[PDB]
Amino acid sequence: FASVYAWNRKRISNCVADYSVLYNSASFSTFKCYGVSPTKLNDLCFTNV
Amino acid sequence: GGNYNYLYRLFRKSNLKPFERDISTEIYQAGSTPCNGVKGFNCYFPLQS
Numbered sequence: 001f002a003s004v005y006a007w008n009r010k011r012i013s014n015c016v017a018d019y020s021v022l023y024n025s026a027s028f029s030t031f032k033c034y035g036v037s038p039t040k041l042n043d044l045c046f047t048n049v
Numbered sequence: 050g051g052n053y054n055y056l057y058r059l060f061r062k063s064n065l066k067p068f069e070r071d072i073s074t075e076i077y078q079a080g081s082t083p084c085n086g087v088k089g090f091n092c093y094f095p096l097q098s
Contacts, residue, residue, distance in 0.1 A: 024081050026090070039079075 012049035018042070053098040060095045 002008040019041040023031070036044070060077040078084045080091025088094070 056096040
């Protein structure tokens with residue numbers, strides 16, 4: 001992973017993303033979602049990430 | 050000093066019927082793994098001050 005002052009930026013567009021497996025992963029110590037609930041991620045979606 | 054006597058609900062399994070009352074302070078399982086009455090990951094106290 002790149003350094004903090006040169007944080008790596010990635011564009012996600014035109015693909016399907018399964019957020020359920022990402023949320024259910026226990027390897028993440030901190031997981032904070034603010035805009036929308038993590039459960040309802042797979043229902044509504046925007047144009048890019 | 051801050052009033053902590055006022056507690057409001059944030060998490061619930063479903064919605065509330067009109068003129069309904071809920072007082073059960075049960076642990077909420079926010080993930081696939083059941084909490085089994087134990088506070089932890091994907092587990093939150095439904096009441097907040």
